[PDB]
């Protein structure tokens, strides 16, 4: 039988005889579009990093916010369908704040990641017998870089399908497959913070169409002491020229 | 194909289509434009007057005002235009009630957008074939601001934009004539940058233009047709060549 | 040509779709269900006593024939007999038995078979407007002995048509029966029938659904009803043994 | 061949036309003939009874039916979509108008309250319309006598002398060959049965026919003699024998 | 071209009468056929929608 | 497959006044184990083939009978859960027949609150019918009763019942008895006389081993309630049965 | 192509909703309706398709209507869907007066009542109205007025329009002889000429028509919804020498 | 305090030979005070007139809702309202609110344009239709006016002969009432014309 994918494709709630339903597997293909992202974790500091897809020379590129704050000790990224993000994160923070009421403490990081993943699952029944709120499972594949006392510095990969993972060095989006092999072979368990910011500003170079500058990229780094901050342009340009001064020698 | 009917369902690529098909409907509609300097923000729109019986004192003016310190333009189709405004200005006015400080513009555009990203969620509802441009300052601040909405439910900040018909001519015209790190610094200059941005596509008419500007102190004004003919004709001297 | 453009171009699976002939077909396909038992009832009037008869087949021996019956005592003074499958007879029977009641709770007396055929038929219309429910594949008969009208028979079909006959039958075998009492009435020109006793009027109606039916009947293959003022009930088996002795 | 703009109602075709209404109006033209014409001092409403079998008492069900004392009706087409209609029409006199105006309504405001009971069922799928038609006919005291038609679409063409059903145009061809301006009721009544002798087959007696009138008050039908002003009904169904002599006068 | 039937139709009256020629009258009725009987041909519905 | 159009849905009628989705459910009962119920002079006895797919299953605690409030039982043959969905409506309403009337629900009035429910599924469109045919009987004021339930909504009163794939067989050995014994079996030979049958009805499935189950309700031996079996009673009934057929 | 015609929320790739445009050919079946804007009082007009002899075409106005003593309408489209949104309009104007105690302006309800016709071209499995209108009003802010509303929801203000059938010429004939002053009695003698010259028949009787007039023309200023009866169009009709 | 005994207003109606007469008072204010010389407590809808008493909100609020309606019944039926329906409408348009009601003594007056007849009536706050023919009243001072109107009204009266027996019935009463009487107003009605007169009395 050859008409297994041709007909069982479009309705969400149709098992195909191979066991699988497709309209979720296509949602996974969405975030393969968009602009890439990286997350590296450390005993000393978590770090992210993105491109920006310079589209026109007159836009004000502080606006498209592939990276956000979500709480004082958590921060996100996303390499997917845009508008379906701002329906996500205005829930995800809302738990962390709500949690600061019902329990008066900086929430853990995974529980937040479990509240999201119990939201995209609303093309169906959620955990507590809920019914439905949508029919368009959406591509906003996240990276939740955070800190909490039990287990230190973490990141995750939260996908629409619900299931997630505690990756240590991830890279999602269009430049993944060329990267996630490159980060496969250059992740010790004993790196620094700044032995990573330069790294993630080397893979990003080779993988992206244009050349690398401050304008077409940025990054962030939380810390248990300072918090989520999105670095500055002239600060980033410090690291870029620093790299070249390391390459030639 | 089959995947190009509804909103709920995806391609085997990732593309969701209907939203992409609305934006084709934008481009079956008249232009618009928005420029900002430092002490001014402006807006333009090529209208028509192609009929004589039609009374002209209530001319079809793309512009609408949400509050004193805010204006709007649109594109696409106008049966929907009247809606978003009629919910937008409601929301600005149900804000200062609830807060007695008027809208940070970034609060407004996240409600014109928000009404588009609910009408792209569920089948049984249609999107808006529309695409806006905002222009207005905050209260007690000088920084001139401008966004655009879009039926995908997204929005971005722009120093200069042109949407509607033949925009793919006007943008690159504005990629030269502008420079982010030295804007126009006078309320005349943005207009001249703005008028000759229309003159590429507008059969050298001058009755076929509307300009409306905005400034602090809750200021807005529409300009005079005779105040354009001298902002028009003096350019033509400058291409006597 | 009749249903060729029907069976091909839809018009035979939605209820609420007309054909360009005007005909909707679903309800016109319901009636084929009425004959899915090969069963054939009857009803006639009296001076004050009404009767209805039905076969009661002889399937495999394991049944308990006390319960196989298509005669449902609805309320007092009322009764009914169905033509169609059993399950689609109950839901009509029960939607009624809780309808004569509330009337008597809300208007102070018992409904006749007039209203009870106008009410239940004012519903099967509705279910051929909306898609609430497939129209019940039946055609059902009512009986009563009213105070203001005397005996009375009525009839109801899945569209909503209802008329109070003088005498009638139904099933796969109407033409054979119906002639074997249509010709009887033009003899005498009496809408009712003589033989005052509800007893003696049965044996009239039996024998007419023997000669024109096609075979001979025992006591077990039948089940029979009757309506008399203050009551409605069913019967015993001797009424035929006190027929053939006389003949 | 089919049309793919006819299996549903909310769909326009390039000629700017809708699907199922056009076929409902054919469901009636296939139906029996019924009519009603007009006069100076009354209105008549007629049809026949094509009794299916001989054993069906053709008296336990009335094509004609009363809505108010001054207003009566008749259909042509489908039946069950009549007695389900009127049972929610006469109410609306007793619900929307009467109780907040004291008195029964005019003849046209009744129609507006029928035709939206007719149009509620042609605006959403999951509803076949009423494959019927109607001829409402009555009277009131500022616009006078009247006659009115009501189609399944919700439109109500008025009229003077008209018929519907299969035997329509043969009849409508005949009316103006016999209709006038100053006609009187008992002159307008034998017309409206010799109109029906052509569109018929077989028997033509009181037990295969029934009709109505409108006129001056019929207080003998009223019941509560003793009031000076409550003049009783204005609508009476002519019995068999009251018809069954006129034919022998013809 | 309807006229081509008219000028034909006029003479047809004279044929029926066996006259050979005509006058204005034999035209003034022709219009009664092609025009009025086009309006009295297919305007014979009453059911319509404004 | 007479109609390729009139099967994709429910709530339709074929040109031959039929609806076929019911006529396909019935072919899901046939692919199910055998189950019976005998009527007796005092009460009833039920039974079933309880197949075993492996050696690993625990015996006598993957039971299949479901006992309604103390005086009626229900056994399945078909798709089990649609069954167990069904008693779990019959086990609740009967209470709602008790708390208004205070009597235990009779048997017929328990049927019409099932046989009228099932018929509801076979007239809407957004649902599926049931793939069961459950037997149920018991005891009440006016004697015993026993019925069959069938996904068309029908139910009829039976002296003997059998379903599943052993239909054509057990509809014989229950015809014999009702010729020998019109006078009503007692409730201590029917039982072993049931075991005779399920060991005869197995032989469509001589491949695989299995397990036998019984449940029984009659006034004399039980005082008018529902109950399983245990001990010498069934063990002898086993010993009775496979004896006679060897 | 894969046919995008079946719901009014489908958006063909070129961006155009088909099932709206269809309505805008469901209007051509209608019966013409005209209104000219004078300098001292608007005129309206109309024409009917079905005019058989034995039906009371004397009192029954089917197209022309009122909304209050200031405003009038002339319909062109389906008739089942005119009562629905001309009672609503009446019910809107009063429920403005009732709670601001001054009369309704035209630009409000036309703005409103057209957004209603947009609330159905967007959501649900609903249909868009097959309707159009020709409003005719007065108000302090602008005085005399003329307006128009498609079956989409888009409206525009005008000086003289025909809707319905054969507007193509009936605009063309109109726009090349409409002077800009056009005293009221000089407007009527234009409107008949358009219908006289655009229609299909040749009779243009008194029964087929109705044309009304708004008038400020009285002293002690106020408005007058003057509708004309059969007896005086005849005076209008003989006077022209048809 | 009662709602009915706050502001203060008195109205009168009276039948006559092809003429009627209706009048009201103009005082208005809080308890033990007065604010306005000028509040036309009486209204008209079509040829049919109406007059209200009691609480001023439910005066001003009944004007509007009845005005919301008769401007539909004219548009819808192409005919004005006549009284003998209107008098029923005010019953059922008040009896819907049997609980949380209005606090009014209404009146009504008008001619029936078919039979040239006169007509009046009165009501209570939940719709009891009183159909007296000679006269009917309402207000705070009803008990101070059923006496000094009974003895003064004969049957079969003439307009100005009927006029001056309203005013004196209206003046000698309101001058005794405690919460009324800063200027009055009267209407005399015939089949085809109407006129308004005011009247003279005290002041503060």
From Swiss-Prot, chain B:
<comment type="function">
    <text>The proteasome degrades poly-ubiquitinated proteins in the cytoplasm and in the nucleus. It is essential for the regulated turnover of proteins and for the removal of misfolded proteins. The proteasome is a multicatalytic proteinase complex that is characterized by its ability to cleave peptides with Arg, Phe, Tyr, Leu, and Glu adjacent to the leaving group at neutral or slightly basic pH. It has an ATP-dependent proteolytic activity.</text>
</comment>
<dbReference type="InterPro" id="IPR029055">
    <property type="entry name" value="Ntn_hydrolases_N"/>
</dbReference>
<dbReference type="InterPro" id="IPR000426">
    <property type="entry name" value="Proteasome_asu_N"/>
</dbReference>
<dbReference type="GO" id="GO:0043161">
    <property type="term" value="P:proteasome-mediated ubiquitin-dependent protein catabolic process"/>
</dbReference>
<dbReference type="GO" id="GO:0034515">
    <property type="term" value="C:proteasome storage granule"/>
</dbReference>
<dbReference type="Pfam" id="PF10584">
    <property type="entry name" value="Proteasome_A_N"/>
</dbReference>
<keyword id="KW-0963">Cytoplasm</keyword>
<dbReference type="InterPro" id="IPR001353">
    <property type="entry name" value="Proteasome_sua/b"/>
</dbReference>
<comment type="similarity">
    <text>Belongs to the peptidase T1A family.</text>
</comment>
<dbReference type="GO" id="GO:0000502">
    <property type="term" value="C:proteasome complex"/>
</dbReference>
<keyword id="KW-0539">Nucleus</keyword>
<dbReference type="InterPro" id="IPR016050">
    <property type="entry name" value="Proteasome_bsu_CS"/>
</dbReference>
From Swiss-Prot, chain E:
<comment type="similarity">
    <text>Belongs to the AAA ATPase family.</text>
</comment>
<comment type="function">
    <text>The 26S proteasome is involved in the ATP-dependent degradation of ubiquitinated proteins. The regulatory (or ATPase) complex confers ATP dependency and substrate specificity to the 26S complex.</text>
</comment>
<comment type="subunit">
    <text>May form a homodimer or a heterodimer with a related family member. Interacts with OLA1, TMA17, and UBR1.</text>
</comment>
<protein>
    <recommendedName>
        <fullName>26S proteasome regulatory subunit 8 homolog</fullName>
    </recommendedName>
</protein>
Swiss-Prot record, chain F:
<protein>
    <recommendedName>
        <fullName>Probable proteasome subunit alpha type-7</fullName>
    </recommendedName>
</protein>
<dbReference type="InterPro" id="IPR000426">
    <property type="entry name" value="Proteasome_asu_N"/>
</dbReference>
<keyword id="KW-0647">Proteasome</keyword>
<dbReference type="GO" id="GO:0043161">
    <property type="term" value="P:proteasome-mediated ubiquitin-dependent protein catabolic process"/>
</dbReference>
<keyword id="KW-0963">Cytoplasm</keyword>
<comment type="similarity">
    <text>Belongs to the peptidase T1A family.</text>
</comment>
<dbReference type="Pfam" id="PF10584">
    <property type="entry name" value="Proteasome_A_N"/>
</dbReference>
<dbReference type="GO" id="GO:0005634">
    <property type="term" value="C:nucleus"/>
</dbReference>
<dbReference type="InterPro" id="IPR023332">
    <property type="entry name" value="Proteasome_alpha-type"/>
</dbReference>
<dbReference type="InterPro" id="IPR029055">
    <property type="entry name" value="Ntn_hydrolases_N"/>
</dbReference>
<dbReference type="GO" id="GO:0010499">
    <property type="term" value="P:proteasomal ubiquitin-independent protein catabolic process"/>
</dbReference>
<dbReference type="GO" id="GO:0003729">
    <property type="term" value="F:mRNA binding"/>
</dbReference>
UniProtKB/Swiss-Prot annotation, chain H:
<comment type="subunit">
    <text>The 26S proteasome consists of a 20S proteasome core and two 19S regulatory subunits. The 20S proteasome core is composed of 28 subunits that are arranged in four stacked rings, resulting in a barrel-shaped structure. The two end rings are each formed by seven alpha subunits, and the two central rings are each formed by seven beta subunits. The catalytic chamber with the active sites is on the inside of the barrel.</text>
</comment>
<keyword id="KW-1017">Isopeptide bond</keyword>
<dbReference type="GO" id="GO:0043161">
    <property type="term" value="P:proteasome-mediated ubiquitin-dependent protein catabolic process"/>
</dbReference>
<dbReference type="Pfam" id="PF00227">
    <property type="entry name" value="Proteasome"/>
</dbReference>
<keyword id="KW-0963">Cytoplasm</keyword>
<dbReference type="InterPro" id="IPR001353">
    <property type="entry name" value="Proteasome_sua/b"/>
</dbReference>
<feature type="cross-link" description="Glycyl lysine isopeptide (Lys-Gly) (interchain with G-Cter in ubiquitin)">
    <location>
        <position position="69"/>
    </location>
</feature>
<dbReference type="InterPro" id="IPR033811">
    <property type="entry name" value="Proteasome_beta_3"/>
</dbReference>
<dbReference type="InterPro" id="IPR029055">
    <property type="entry name" value="Ntn_hydrolases_N"/>
</dbReference>
<dbReference type="InterPro" id="IPR023333">
    <property type="entry name" value="Proteasome_suB-type"/>
</dbReference>
<dbReference type="InterPro" id="IPR016050">
    <property type="entry name" value="Proteasome_bsu_CS"/>
</dbReference>
<keyword id="KW-0832">Ubl conjugation</keyword>
